[PDB]
Write a protein that binds this ligand. Structure first.
Ligand code: CLA
Ligand code: CLA
Ligand code: CLA
Ligand code: CLA
Ligand code: CLA
Ligand code: CLA
Ligand code: CLA
Ligand code: SQD
Ligand code: PTY
Ligand code: LHG
Ligand code: SF4
Lengths: 83, 209, 41, 230, 740
């Protein structure tokens, strides 16, 4: 996880893609309950600052999912011999 | 209205403070029934008196041993006593068992029926050998004592029960720090006074692994 | 004490007290004395 | 200003400017009056006992955070001798970490003294919590007058617990309450830190502060997690 | 939404209800007029449904009941640890596991019991144990008896804490019904919390404690100079030499360089040749991966923070056209019925215990466990029987839910209602496959017996004669043997030596060797399939016909456990679902007895034995491929070729196994009174005895009555099962101790 490593780049890009995905619809966040196609835009608790629904549990889950996706990508690329 | 065993606690309903040393300490609800209350009072009194007698004898023997007189330790005193005793083992314990059985069923049937032995059945004595209170007899057992005065008798009762409880604590301390140190209680006391900052219950090896 | 000793007096505890007493009595007889066959004093 | 990052809804509905804390940070929810409803003492999950344990944990954390770092800078300076100046976990609290041999008594002797004294203290505290003001009625060495306490068992006051007795006005008392609970919540993280720093470096917390100060990039979380002893 | 709803002090803590034994039931609250009052008292003692109709009090009752059972199990575990600490040869067994038999029970010299203190070696005498606790205490790194004493005292402390917790959570602070109905929070907390936290804690304990101790143990180092695990925990220098990846010090974990941890988180197939058990590095990576899988699965459901899954939505959304309403109401049933959840949990627990027994006999996870044949056989048989009991109880409590907690209002066209609708088709098809499996397994056995008896072995169903080769099982064996070659290239060897090509051996005895499957294994496996199909037929028929039937339409109003509806319709005896479970217990007993007979014979004839320089010699003569095809071969070469040590056990260390064998014969035979007979004859005999006691005035105030018909059936099945279980236990243990 040295600054400049391909694993660091993969981790940061995954985290940023997950925050982008949860910022404007586009992900089953605390604001967006999920149907088979993830609709209906509900509201609970409060966002505490920036708009939409980035609560304390929204960034906690998306960071967890973004981290967990990154272990799959890095170790998958490491197993096949990439980066 | 009374100093309890724990400040702010709720005293038991069966402990109204009318007993000697009634500090209201009874979490297991023993002595709730009045007959068993009397039996517990009797048992506490006799265990207390025997604890004080044994502790006083142990302390006297240990002090006499420390001053230079030939005396055994409080432990295994009888083991080295029997080899020089004219009375052998077996006969001594059985003699004391018969005599103490006589005295103890006499006081037992005095406890069951107060004043039952004051009818002159035992050698024609009426005022003597008659229980004055629950665990407190009279006649022969109060030769010169001040139990006639009520306040002095109550103060002596409180003093007796408190000294008894202190002697129970002393006897358990005796066996505990004898198993800890294998020395006389006076020797342990002198070691505690000589080096209080180091010699204690913690630096004896045993009981603190 | 009365409320607890009423439970203490019911049959399962009596099913223990007699059992403990008789069992321990027979253990001590078979322990201090060896295994005999004849009651020839 | 108000509320916090977690700040669950249906949790601010039972607290608004009442407790000395009350910053709206109850994401899980444990001060609901519906919890432990009924009769009797019941359980520990209730606002009174939770506030009581929070302020007690707070003050104990203040004392601990003062005592853990106090010998250290004074050992760096010439205040206390460096022979006695040792890390807080090497004083005998963790004998695997180390003990101080040059004490006036055995560590278990001091443990028994602490056990007796603080058993008296905490059992009197618990008995006054069960029965408010009941320690001022049973005779205790002639000092029953300073154990009267107040309506809140957490904040007793009296001739000794508040011998300075300043903050008589409600506003100054509320400010002192907020200051106490905020410095206690800081000492919370101070102890959490001090323990984590001790387990991740094996050295004292002020030495870790010096390490972060001299080299922030080379001595931080990422380098110390990948180092020796953690 | 999810919160902690708790009612404080609902029940006073007093012995008032202890004074009167009959207080939970209003029928038993009057008095003991008849002797059946006592059996109803001990029978309806924990039946909380008829004590009260409130679900909240039932939930509190079962919560503190589970607390009490947990405290009891913790007391038992603490007692086992104390026995291993005080009366054991664990110190001797650590220095010599291949020559010193384990022993942890010491008898008294009171009456002739000194012969039971067998010469197990190491200068120690006692009962040779079979639970395998020494293997567990060698896996989890334990050296001295001080550590076992500490574990026992901690277990006693936690047991007292659990009992105090039950008392508190019932009498002092009882949770409400909404607290128990938080199913999503329950599942998340018992997936991520319980299972995941325990798996991660065990992985950490194995990595920081068990791995260095087991690395030094199999290297020939005596345990006396082995460093204590706290030295490995605190000091990285001592743990660095045994495992070089610890010199990195948690750097590869956060930097995603987990390939550097390949020294103590290995992925190896097979067993450790020094000890015979699984590699502790493999178990460490296993429990770490299990902790990962349970941490990720424990964050699936939605409790309070919007995100997650709602189980009602998941159930109601899976609807498929041949099922009508698909899982429409099952969330409402499982959140309101304790017996339905009891059936599900007991069925899955029993099946998982069966998997546990099979996967310990397959891959021994403990050092010096494969060579200890007694511990392996005892573990397999014991978890086999416990799994069977849990499955039978699952069927019983499913039938109880069917009788009591099932209502037709919530379910109209769902899966449960449609299973009720076509129950006759299910029972008929199960009967057909039952008859089919029974014929072409047991008739094959009888035909082989006949052709052996008729002097025509070439007409038998054997390997020498025409054979039924189990091609599917052998192909699965070959695939798993070649699985590390292609499909799992990172595995060092095969996951087990069931299908391998090498033989491991510790101390001159075979630890685990490849297993060959022939016609006899085919016959026994299809016998097992037949027997399990019959038992599941009995249990499923009892569950399905508990509510209503073509015979008795009003069986729902007659309760779950009733003896009969009278001699009408030709006699409706044993028509209740309780009697279906009563028969299913015996069918379970037959199934698991034949299963463990197959296990013992196959493992003694083709796996267990002593390795020599000239080949491998097993315990028997390898006669399973020649004698397991006939009933007489099975009898003579398993029950008569063995059990020669049980009969001659007298005067030796294992004579108590012979005594237990004959007492088990007694109890098994004594049960057939309560099974064949009825009640009217016994009631009339009791009337005559009552007259005898009336003649000389010793008449009890309580009227002596014969046992109830359900009571008599329960006594019969209990005595029968206890006798059979103890018979097989004594025979198996004596055979595996005197030989293995
Ligand atoms: C994709 C971009 C993005 C992302 C990831 C976030 C995410 C966040 N912002 Mg926001 N923000 C955004 C766009 C974004 N915002 C925009 C477009 C604006 C308007 C200019 C803001 C204005 C804003 C303010 C003013 C504050 C936040 C805060 C926050 C945090 C709320 C949770 C918290 O700290 O309590 C969270 C990390 C708050 C914060 O971090 O608390 C200190 C805060 O004070 N943001
Ligand atoms: C960049 C994309 C990418 C790539 C190339 C891989 C590639 C790989 N990952 Mg990975 N994975 C990814 C993303 C990726 N993953 C993501 C995003 C996640 C998070 C959900 C995961 C989660 C994940 C897990 C949990 C596991 C893998 C595993 C694997 C291996 C499976 C293929 C294999 O060995 O043969 C095919 C193997 C088979 C068994 C065939 C499947 C046949 C089925 C069972 C029928 C391979 C090295 C596995 C591994 O470690 O293998 C070495 C493993 O356990 N990955
Ligand atoms: C003559 C023989 C004899 C007899 C009949 C008794 C009988 C009794 N003694 Mg006693 N005792 C004896 C010898 C005897 N003791 C001896 C030799 C000693 C040693 C000094 C004691 C020390 C003793 C104590 C310390 C106590 C009893 C107590 C008792 C009572 C309890 C009986 C029981 O539960 O068992 C009973 C009245 C108990 C009592 O009186 O409780 C009310 C009690 O506390 N006894
Ligand atoms: C010192 C403790 C102590 C106290 C305060 C009491 C007090 C009482 N007892 Mg009791 N008693 C005691 C010990 C004590 N007893 C012992 C040990 C026994 C067993 C032998 C008894 C046996 C006994 C009986 C059988 C009866 C009483 C009765 C009484 C009452 C009479 C009042 C009286 O005369 O005062 C007593 C005053 C004293 C005992 C103080 C004298 C203490 C001396 C000076 C100590 C020195 C002697 C010692 C052996 C030396 C120790 C040496 C050491 C330093 C090495 C009163 C409540 C009677 C009663 O209640 O009737 C209504 C009654 O019937 N007691
Ligand atoms: C992550 C949190 C957590 C954990 C670890 C557990 C753990 C457990 N629960 Mg569960 N439970 C939880 C949250 C949790 N619970 C929640 C949130 C609810 C409400 C929805 C419940 C409601 C619930 C019910 C209704 C029942 C359980 C039961 C059990 C026990 C099952 C016995 C077993 O499988 O053997 C494992 C055995 C052990 C590990 C033995 C050690 C037990 C230790 C002492 C428990 C420590 C865990 C605990 C959560 C710590 C905090 C408690 C604190 C106040 C002291 C097990 C100990 C059953 C029970 O009564 O047992 C208590 C049961 O019937 N649970
Ligand atoms: C789940 C069980 C578990 C546990 C308990 C540990 C624990 C430990 N491991 Mg291990 N580890 C585990 C699993 C586990 N590991 C697994 C699964 C792997 C993967 C293979 C590893 C891989 C691994 C490596 C490679 C290394 C460790 C190391 C360590 C140590 C460093 C801990 C650390 O960095 O935190 C730092 C400490 C803290 C964060 C402290 C926690 C906070 C404290 C408790 C707060 C308390 C303060 C309180 C307020 C006041 C205290 C009371 C006071 C008044 C007396 C520690 C002993 C390293 C080592 O040996 O170092 C010694 C090391 O090199 N481990
Ligand atoms: C070993 C003892 C034994 C045996 C063999 C049977 C046999 C039977 N029971 Mg029973 N059972 C027994 C004890 C036994 N019972 C006991 C003690 C209980 C009480 C718990 C039960 C409880 C019980 C229940 C609850 C159920 C059964 C059922 C069955 C049937 C299963 C048929 C099947 O699939 O197998 C195939 C057939 C056989 C094994 C019979 C022998 C066949 C041999 C090999 C002869 C083959 C053909 C032959 C050549 C024809 C001869 C011709 C001749 C007339 C000239 C069968 C009639 C079930 C049923 O009705 O069927 C689904 C059922 O539901 N039984
Ligand atoms: C072990 C023996 C004690 C077992 C039960 C402990 C919990 C209890 O009943 O009271 C909890 C008590 C105080 O009751 C407190 O009592 C308060 C008032 S009352 O006394 O319950 O009415 C109540 O509000 C609070 O929730 C409760 O914690 O808290 C303690 O620390 C005492 C028990 C210590 C062990
Ligand atoms: C017996 C007294 C109990 C204490 C025993 C004790 O401390 O022994 C330690 C190891 O044994 C033990 O820890 C044994 C504990 C059980 C006995 C060695 O202690 P040490 O001399 O290495 O102590 C310096 C470390 N702080
Ligand atoms: C051997 C036993 C064969 C049973 C065959 C019928 C199964 C019961 C049945 O009809 O189920 C119907 C099911 C499809 O129905 P749906 O898709 O509408 O139901 C799915 C929801 O219940 C979810 O089909 C199968 O299970 C196919 C595989 C059968 C095997
Ligand atoms: S024999 Fe018994 S079970 Fe059968 S119908 Fe008669 S009374 Fe009922």
């Amino acid at each position: 996880s040295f600054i400049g490593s391909p694993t660091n780049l993969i981790m940061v890009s995954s985290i940023g893609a997950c925050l982008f995905a949860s910022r404007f619809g586009l992900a089953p966040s605390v604001r967006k309950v999920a149907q088979p196609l993830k609709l209906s835009d509900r509201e609970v608790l409060q966002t505490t600052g920036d708009p939409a629904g980035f609560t304390a549990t929204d960034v906690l889950a998306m960071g967890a999912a973004g981290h967990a996706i990154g272990v799959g990508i890095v170790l998958g690329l490491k197993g096949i011999g990439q980066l | 209205d009374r100093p309890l065993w724990s400040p702010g606690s709720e005293p038991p309903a069966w402990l109204d403070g009318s007993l000697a040393g009634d500090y209201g300490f009874d979490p297991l609800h023993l002595s709730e029934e009045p007959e068993m209350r009397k039996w517990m009072v009797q048992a506490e009194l006799v265990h207390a008196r025997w604890a004080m007698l044994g502790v006083a004898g142990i302390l006297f023997t240990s002090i006499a041993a420390k001053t230079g007189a030939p005396f055994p330790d409080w432990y295994d005193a009888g083991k080295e006593a029997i080899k020089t005793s004219p009375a052998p083992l077996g006969s001594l314990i059985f003699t004391e068992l018969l005599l103490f059985g006589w005295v103890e069923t006499k006081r037992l049937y005095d406890l069951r029926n107060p004043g039952s032995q004051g009818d002159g059945s035992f050698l024609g004595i009426t005022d003597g050998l008659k229980g004055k209170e629950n665990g407190y007899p009279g006649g022969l057992f109060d030769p010169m004592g001040m139990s006639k005065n009520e306040a002095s008798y109550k103060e002596a009762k409180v003093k007796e029960i408190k000294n008894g409880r202190l002697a129970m604590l002393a006897f358990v301390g005796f066996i505990a720090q004898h198993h800890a140190t294998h020395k006389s209680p006076i020797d342990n006391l002198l070691d505690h006074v000589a080096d209080p900052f180091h010699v204690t219950f913690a630096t004896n090896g045993v009981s603190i692994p | 004490m009365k409320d607890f000793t009423t439970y203490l007096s019911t049959a399962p505890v009596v099913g223990l007290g007699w059992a403990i007493f008789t069992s321990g009595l027979l253990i001590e007889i078979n322990r201090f004395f060896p295994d005999p066959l004849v009651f020839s004093f | 200003d108000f509320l916090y990052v977690g700040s669950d809804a249906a949790a601010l509905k039972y607290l608004d400017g009442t407790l000395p804390g009350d910053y709206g940070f109850d994401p899980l929810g444990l001060l609901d009056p519906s919890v432990s409803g009924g009769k009797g003492e019941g359980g520990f999950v209730n606002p009174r006992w939770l506030q009581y344990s929070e302020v007690i944990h707070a003050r104990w954390a203040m004392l601990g955070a003062a005592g853990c770092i106090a010998p250290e800078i004074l050992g760096k300076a010439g205040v206390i001798p460096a022979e006695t100046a040792v890390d807080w976990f090497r004083t005998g609290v963790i004998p695997p970490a180390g003990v101080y041999k040059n004490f006036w008594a055995d560590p278990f002797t001091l443990f028994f003294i602490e056990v007796v004294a603080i058993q008296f203290a905490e059992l009197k505290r618990l008995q006054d919590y069960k029965n408010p003001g009941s320690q001022s009625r049973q005779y205790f060495l002639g000092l029953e007058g300073l154990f009267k306490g107040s309506d809140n068992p957490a904040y007793p006051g009296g001739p000794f617990f508040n011998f300075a007795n300043f903050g008589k006005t409600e506003e100054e008392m509320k400010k002192l309450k907020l200051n106490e609970i905020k410095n206690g919540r800081l000492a919370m993280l101070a102890m959490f830190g001090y323990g984590a720093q001790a387990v991740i470096t094996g050295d004292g917390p002020f030495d870790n502060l010096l390490a972060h100060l001299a080299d922030p990039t080379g001595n931080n979380l990422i380098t110390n997690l990948g180092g020796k002893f953690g | 939404k999810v919160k902690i709803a708790v009612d404080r002090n609902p029940v006073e803590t007093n012995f008032e209800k202890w004074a009167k034994p009959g207080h939970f039931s209003r029928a038993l609250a009057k008095g003991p007029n008849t002797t059946t009052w006592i059996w109803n008292l001990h029978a309806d003692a924990h039946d909380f449904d008829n004590h009260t109709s409130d679900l909240e009090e039932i939930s509190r009752k079962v919560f503190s009941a589970h607390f009490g059972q947990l405290g009891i199990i913790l007391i038992w575990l603490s007692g086992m640890y104390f026995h291993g600490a005080r009366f054991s040869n664990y110190e001797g067994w650590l220095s010599d596991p291949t020559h010193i038999k384990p022993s942890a029970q010491v008898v008294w010299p009171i009456v002739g019991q000194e012969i039971l203190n067998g010469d197990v070696g190491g200068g120690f005498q006692g009962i040779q144990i079979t639970s395998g606790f020494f293997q567990l205490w060698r896996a989890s790194g334990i050296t001295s008896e001080l550590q076992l004493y500490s574990t026992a005292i901690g277990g006693l402390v936690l047991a007292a804490a659990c009992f105090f917790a039950g008392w508190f959570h019932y009498h002092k602070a009882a949770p409400k019904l909404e607290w128990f109905q938080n199913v999503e929070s329950m599942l998340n907390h018992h997936l991520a919390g319980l299972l995941g936290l325990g798996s991660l804690a065990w992985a950490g304990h194995q990595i920081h404690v068990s791995l260095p101790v087991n690395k030094l143990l199999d290297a020939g180092v005596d345990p006396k100079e082995i460093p204590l695990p706290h030295e490995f925990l605190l000091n990285q220098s001592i743990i660095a030499d045994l495992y070089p990846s610890f010199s990195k010090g948690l750097a590869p974990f956060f930097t995603l360089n987990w390939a550097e941890y390949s020294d103590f988180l290995t992925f190896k197939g097979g067993l450790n040749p020094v000890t015979g058990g699984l590699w502790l590095s493999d178990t460490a990576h296993h429990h770490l991966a299990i902790a990962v899988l349970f941490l990720v699965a424990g964050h699936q459901y939605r409790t309070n923070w919007g995100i997650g899954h709602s189980i009602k939505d998941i159930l109601e959304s899976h609807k498929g056209p041949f099922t009508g309403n698909g899982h429409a109401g099952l969330y409402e049933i499982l959140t309101t019925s304790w017996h339905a959840q009891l059936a599900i949990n007991l069925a899955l627990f029993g099946s998982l215990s069966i998997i546990v027994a099979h996967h310990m006999y397959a891959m021994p996870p403990y050092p010096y466990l494969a060579t200890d044949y007694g511990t392996q056989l005892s573990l397999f048989t014991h978890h086999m029987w416990i799994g069977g009991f849990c499955v039978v109880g699952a069927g019983a409590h499913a039938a109880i839910f069917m009788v009591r907690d099932y209502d037709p209002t919530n379910n109209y066209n769902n899966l449960l209602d449609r299973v009720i609708r076509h129950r006759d088709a299910i029972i008929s098809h199960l009967n057909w496959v039952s008859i089919f499996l029974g014929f072409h397994s047991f008739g094959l056995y009888i035909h082989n017996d006949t052709m052996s008896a008729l002097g025509r072995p070439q007409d038998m169903f054997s390997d020498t004669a025409i054979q039924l080769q189990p091609v599917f099982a052998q192909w699965i064996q070959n695939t798993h043997f070649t699985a590390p070659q292609l499909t799992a290239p990172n595995a060092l060897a095969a996951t087990s030596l069931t299908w391998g090509g090498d033989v491991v051996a510790v101390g001159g005895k075979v630890a685990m060797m490849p297993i060959a499957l022939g016609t006899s294994d085919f016959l026994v496996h299809h016998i097992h399939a037949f027997t399990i199909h019959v038992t599941v037929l009995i249990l499923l028929k009892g569950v399905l016909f508990a509510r209503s039937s073509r015979l008795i339409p009003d069986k729902a109003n007659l309760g779950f456990r009733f003896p009969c509806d009278g001699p009408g319709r030709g006699g409706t005896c044993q028509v209740s679902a309780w009697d279906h479970v009563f028969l299913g217990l015996f069918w379970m007993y037959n199934s698991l007895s034949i299963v463990i007979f197959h296990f013992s014979w196959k493992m003694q004839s083709d796996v267990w034995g002593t390795v020599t320089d000239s080949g491998v010699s097993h315990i028997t003569g390898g006669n399973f491929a020649q004698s397991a095809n006939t009933i007489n071969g099975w009898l003579r070469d398993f029950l008569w070729a063995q059990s020669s040590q049980v009969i001659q056990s007298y005067g030796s260390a294992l004579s108590a196994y012979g005594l237990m064998f004959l007492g088990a014969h007694f109890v098994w035979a004594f049960s057939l009174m309560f099974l064949f007979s009825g009640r009217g004859y016994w009631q009339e005999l009791i009337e005559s005895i009552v007259w005898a006691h009336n003649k000389l005035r010793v008449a009890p105030s309580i009227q002596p009555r014969a046992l109830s018909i359900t009571q008599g059936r329960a006594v019969g099945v209990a005595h029968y099962l206890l006798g059979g279980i103890a018979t097989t236990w004594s025979f198996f243990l004596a055979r595996i101790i005197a030989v293995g």
